[PDB]
Amino acid sequence: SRITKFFQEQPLEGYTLFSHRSAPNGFKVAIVLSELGFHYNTIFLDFNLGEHRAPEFVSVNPNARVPALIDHGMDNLSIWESGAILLHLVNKYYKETGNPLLWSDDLADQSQINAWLFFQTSGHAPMIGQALHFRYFHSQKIASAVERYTDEVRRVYGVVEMALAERREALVMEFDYPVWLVGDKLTIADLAFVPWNNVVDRIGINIKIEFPEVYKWTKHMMRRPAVIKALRGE
Amino acid sequence: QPLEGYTLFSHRSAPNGFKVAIVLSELGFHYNTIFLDFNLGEHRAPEFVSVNPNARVPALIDHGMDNLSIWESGAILLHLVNKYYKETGNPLLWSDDLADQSQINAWLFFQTSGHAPMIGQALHFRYFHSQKIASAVERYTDEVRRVYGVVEMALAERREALVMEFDYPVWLVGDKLTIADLAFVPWNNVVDRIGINIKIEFPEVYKWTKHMMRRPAVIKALR
Numbered sequence A: 001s002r003i004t005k006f007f008q009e010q011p012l013e014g015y016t017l018f019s020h021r022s023a024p025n026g027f028k029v030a031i032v033l034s035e036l037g038f039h040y041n042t043i044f045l046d047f048n049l050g051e052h053r054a055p056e057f058v059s060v061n062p063n064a065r066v067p068a069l070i071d072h073g074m075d076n077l078s079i080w081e082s083g084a085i086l087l088h089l090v091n092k093y094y095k096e097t098g099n100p101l102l103w104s105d106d107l108a109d110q111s112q113i114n115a116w117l118f119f120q121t122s123g124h125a126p127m128i129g130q131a132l133h134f135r136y137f138h139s140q141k142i143a144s145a146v147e148r149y150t151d152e153v154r155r156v157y158g159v160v161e162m163a164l165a166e167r168r169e170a171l172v173m174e175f176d177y178p179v180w181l182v183g184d185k186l187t188i189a190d191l192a193f194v195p196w197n198n199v200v201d202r203i204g205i206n207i208k209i210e211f212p213e214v215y216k217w218t219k220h221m222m223r224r225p226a227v228i229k230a231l232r233g234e
Numbered sequence B: 001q002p003l004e005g006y007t008l009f010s011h012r013s014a015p016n017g018f019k020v021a022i023v024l025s026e027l028g029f030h031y032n033t034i035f036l037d038f039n040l041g042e043h044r045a046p047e048f049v050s051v052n053p054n055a056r057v058p059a060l061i062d063h064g065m066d067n068l069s070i071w072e073s074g075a076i077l078l079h080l081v082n083k084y085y086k087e088t089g090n091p092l093l094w095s096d097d098l099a100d101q102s103q104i105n106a107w108l109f110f111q112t113s114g115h116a117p118m119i120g121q122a123l124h125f126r127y128f129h130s131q132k133i134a135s136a137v138e139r140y141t142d143e144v145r146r147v148y149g150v151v152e153m154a155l156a157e158r159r160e161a162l163v164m165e166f167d168y169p170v171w172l173v174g175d176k177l178t179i180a181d182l183a184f185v186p187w188n189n190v191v192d193r194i195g196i197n198i199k200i201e202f203p204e205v206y207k208w209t210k211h212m213m214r215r216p217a218v219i220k221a222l223r
């Protein structure tokens, strides 16, 4: 059944990405796969058709959510949770080339990158998701719930904004030059937010004017080829 | 600030904080805990924000590494196991196998982003929101139960494989206790606050938690 069929005709090389057209978390992985130069195909599951129920899938991700990545080169190794997939990809790239692209070979920087990465996947993403749920998909309207989560999303961007502003000032103590969260270079730490930054408007957040720094940062990332490519569907 | 050891910034009721205490004492690392009084706003003090930009606990200062600061319980555990392993050559609560590390990371991210937050939201609507709203409560309590189902199904599959090769301890990854299992511990003990009876609703999870709650380092940390 499309899914069962795929699992009977998998490739020996590359990666297969399970995602959704409205899954920022899914595009997050596509972005990273793109940036790292990994060849992949994407399967956009249809939950309404019950594809996530497909036992073959629940084997790839016991959670039955997207994204999930099968690393075909490593004996169809399976990885679920966008953050685990991210750490796996950069680790693999670094060990195959000696170049920590979007990562770092130094433990200290890695822990900072992980700090941000966990913060985005467990503090930014979930809060944005709850704001969308109550403002649009809940069985009834609860304004206090929508405000709670909407405020937290703002609070979180406050944190990022402040970190980007400081990284900026430091460079001044040597105006539109790219500034980043860790090691003054682009990392998965930065990339992990791009996808979500593009949907926060839907809960009333206007990055352009609410968070000057965040805006310039998300704009620098959004102009990246790999980022536009991934976002288009390549 | 010491030149050796670790300073753990937590809060007496933060399960994420004890998650760090547990891993820390389990790996034999020496540490002192600094319980923040959120009433005074010590988590928002500029002194503490320089450590955790998010202004929340847990936060950890690694004195041996020039007072390197780590925030986010997930990032902290990865740092501690990576550090313990680079020092001893023994992947305690971790793994030398990359495929297993990815799996350990999977569960870890799942717990920190799909378990702890949901449990936290159930608590909020059942006890702290400006108004009682059943649907909001049911939403998160159901999701917390859906998650325990995932864990349950995995421990059951793990026990099945064991039996081939019985209250023997089974684990999420590599048939050895890892930070993936310990991550759920602190929270496992509080789901009773939202109506989930682990013993009854999730048998395997129950045994799995007994084993962790019984461990020495765990007890020492849970104080």
Ligand SMILES: CCCCCCSC[C@H](NC(=O)CC[C@H]([NH3+])C(=O)O)C(=O)NCC(=O)O
Residues within 6 Å of the ligand: A020, A022, A023, A024, A025, A026, A047, A064, A065, A066, A067, A080, A081, A082, A083, A121, A129, A132, A199, B109, B110, B113, B114
């Ligand atoms: C921006 C839109 C609103 C929020 C949706 C988030 S993307 C799709 C969602 N996936 C996730 O939430 C993944 C979370 C997981 N913690 C990860 O980081 O991989 C899913 O599969 N769906 C859950 C389900 O179908 O039950």
Ligand SMILES: N[C@@H](CCC(=O)N[C@@H](CS)C(=O)NCC(=O)O)C(=O)O
Residues within 6 Å of the ligand: A122, A123, B011, B013, B014, B015, B016, B038, B043, B055, B056, B057, B058, B071, B072, B073, B074, B112
């Ligand atoms: N870094 C942790 C954060 C855990 C967390 O949010 N802990 C709560 C304690 S229950 C906290 O700091 N609360 C302070 C507040 O809400 O102001 C994680 O996301 O894994």
